[PDB]
Design a binder for this molecule. Structure first.
Ligand SMILES: [Mg+2]
Ligand SMILES: [Zn+2]
Ligand SMILES: [Zn+2]
Ligand SMILES: [Zn+2]
Ligand SMILES: [Zn+2]
Lengths: 444, 444
């Protein structure tokens, strides 16, 4: 299980493409622990199936390369992530962002759109919740708006992922409407859960005013204030933070909607690989250096959370890999996958020094992107890219005639490292994750 | 390291969709072994990626089901399979059957179309060739033409996979043309290789006559006989074989071209899931009860080969999963995947009983099929299918406007069971497989 999996030499020569330097049996044995996990970090690469991991590596590190973080986890497996059809209760083979996040955080399958509720619209506790119960610290970082499905699944129990704040809930989730005696909108339930560290975007929703409860009349941000939440808005004030706890919880909103993608590149187009020049991704000028990178947020969050002796549970989401995959933008997608990789490196570094940390990197569901031959005449959107190898790689998006390339139901890679990582091996189900995390922590 | 990975109960209830009944740690620990593997069975599902395995499972077993074979191998990982560009020597991200086949059977990357040769055209010994030299028994069974890329890669070193027999070789691989003093076509080199058990289709090439050497004038089929080969053409005669060895090698040719596929169903069409009704596959009425099945051929081979005291190496190929994926034909593709799974079961059953066998199941490269949502208005070819769940599943084939769908470069699953199976876990390269087997067997 040598943690260096790049090609061993000259890929044109016998044995030069090999990634293994020796027999793993001994090494793997030594990486298998029954011992309890003290902390847990779950990295979700949104829409990061094996094709996205492959394409991003080929570009960033070259075909024979190797992601120091993403590719460095010793225990691997694949898992099913199908959802349920609300009415019939039958499987719906292509899950969305909300139906899936609910399963690893809850342990029960649900219909597309549901956050923290089963098909009967019944609530079930999330793992961030139970953790907090047991005494552990909790954090939730993301590069998308916190109201989005992935960060939200940990804290809200809503009937529709679209009920971000007071305005939308009153009409899409009337039974969750605060005025209707419901727990409140995603943003409200988030502010109630009070995880120790929460970072992402979606500041806009915090501007809506609450309609019931104590803080009626006051915007959600003012409520955050009145409730002891420290609010940071940039890289700067973030490092300025020295503690985050139940009386000093940190809440960082680094963008109105989602944060900006790191790379800029043209959108894939019809016969783009043929009628258009190969592209080389460049950095995104719209992104300011004050907006912290996912790795910075992961780092600070790990820093603040590692003080609680009981341990901690942290969930990091490289949100936009899924975003740009829908947008048919190979460069944005790849940049984002590299970004998550840096994030995982930080996780893996802490995990490695600490010893009792269980790191898990996976995705919520597959997506559109496919790596095809350079001469492909495909019916979808395509584009040619100049990889690190000095070769051309062509990516293809061909499952939607609409403005957005759809998700896919193929099972995808799941990798873990640490205490109890052995349960991530083989075929499992996305729900098993919830049970795997809960027992590694001894959550009950 | 469980053998039952099925959902455990009602998938709508909490933990009902779970596949893990406990903690794999000790189970896996107990499956890690480095003792020498006396035998090796390599089951290759042509173009069978994680999307292909998922669709077939969703269909034949239902979303929460599980393949008694394909899904029961405890050790898992993902491997890359990029090819090389002949001139540049740089990676060619999307390999073909020959380059890939050549990688695992030799340990050296090569350009696409090559069999047994590196990019400089130098021949390198295959794992079958080294097994035979070490005294082991060798078997190569496939559901397609024996001259095809996958089975050929083990017995031939040719510059073009198209060099099937005397003719094609004269004009495409003249340097290999026997007349030009070369080793000969794929068919000719196959008869020279003399593995104890060789089974598949592609008998129409054996009808060509050699141009030189001892058997010039004679058809390759006659040469086969003349050289002491037992010729079986159907199930009955196959089952009748009492022994297969170096003095009594078995040659089974069950079809002119590829053997017939198991299932039938229409080809996917533009907007097929919209304009058309759901499909339900039916068995192929063209398939003569007399044509043996992959599982049957896998079984006999195992029976005849398991007689050599030293041990054996067998390679099995579910050829048409790929051919049907190309042909945008779900029913044929899924059927062929169900077919490989039966053969896998036969392998695993032997493996568990014997206890010193290493069984590996994977694919040469990823393919085109995608599992998309029912209302997907895709730009390519789609089709709706009635799955075991009584739910509807849509499959999309949207990477080519030609009459053929293409392979893809995404890294794909590889699973193993037995001595040295731990060398599959994590990220590895397709060439590493060669080295894993070579070490497992003790080939020098
Ligand atoms: Mg998300
Ligand atoms: Zn998603
Ligand atoms: Zn999405
Ligand atoms: Zn192939
Ligand atoms: Zn093919």
């Amino acid at each position: 299980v040598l943690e260096n999996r790049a090609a061993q030499g000259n890929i044109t020569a016998p044995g030069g493409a090999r990634r293994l330097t020796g027999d793993q049996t001994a090494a793997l044995r030594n990486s298998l622990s029954d011992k309890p996990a003290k902390n847990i970090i779950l990295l979700i690469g949104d829409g990061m199936g094996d094709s996205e991991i492959t394409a991003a590596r080929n570009y960033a590190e070259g075909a024979g390369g190797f992601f120091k973080g993403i590719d460095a986890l010793p225990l691997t497996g694949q898992y099913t992530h199908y959802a349920l059809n609300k009415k019939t209760g039958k499987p719906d083979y292509v899950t969305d962002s909300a139906a899936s996040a609910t399963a690893w955080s809850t342990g029960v399958k649900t219909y597309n759109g549901a956050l923290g509720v089963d098909i009967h619209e019944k609530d079930h506790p999330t793992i961030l919740e139970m953790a907090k119960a047991a005494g552990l610290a909790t954090g939730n970082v993301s590069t998308a708006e916190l109201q989005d499905a992935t960060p939200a699944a940990l804290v809200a129990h809503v009937t529709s992922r679209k009920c971000y704040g007071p305005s939308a809930t009153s009409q899409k989730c009337p039974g969750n409407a605060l005025e209707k005696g419901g727990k409140g909108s995603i943003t409200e339930q988030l502010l109630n859960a009070r995880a120790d560290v929460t970072l992402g975007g979606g500041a806009k929703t915090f501007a809506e005013t609450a309609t019931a409860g104590e803080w009626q009349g006051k915007t959600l941000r003012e409520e955050a204030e009145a409730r002891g939440y420290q609010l940071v808005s940039d890289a700067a004030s973030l490092n300025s933070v020295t503690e985050a706890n139940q009386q000093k919880p940190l809440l960082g909103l680094f963008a109105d909607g989602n944060m900006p993608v790191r790379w800029l590149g043209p959108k894939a187009t019809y016969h783009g690989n043929i009628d258009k020049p190969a592209v080389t991704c460049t950095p995104n000028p719209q992104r300011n250096d004050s907006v912290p990178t996912l790795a910075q947020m992961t780092d600070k969050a790990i820093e603040l959370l590692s003080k609680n002796e009981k341990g901690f549970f942290l969930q990091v989401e490289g949100a936009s890999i899924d975003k740009q995959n829908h947008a048919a933008n190979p460069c944005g997608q790849i940049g984002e996958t590299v970004d998550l990789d840096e994030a995982v490196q930080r996780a893996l570094e802490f995990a490695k020094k600490e010893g009792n940390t269980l790191v898990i990197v996976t995705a919520d569901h597959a997506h559109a992107s496919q790596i095809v031959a350079p001469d492909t005449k495909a019916p979808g959107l395509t584009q040619a890219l100049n990889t690190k190898d000095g070769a051309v790689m062509v990516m293809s998006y061909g499952n939607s005639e609409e403005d957005s390339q759809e998700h896919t139901g193929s099972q995808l890679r799941i990798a873990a490292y640490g205490p109890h990582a052995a349960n991530v091996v083989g075929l499992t189900d996305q729900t098993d994750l919830f049970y795997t995390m809960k027992a590694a922590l001894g959550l009950k």
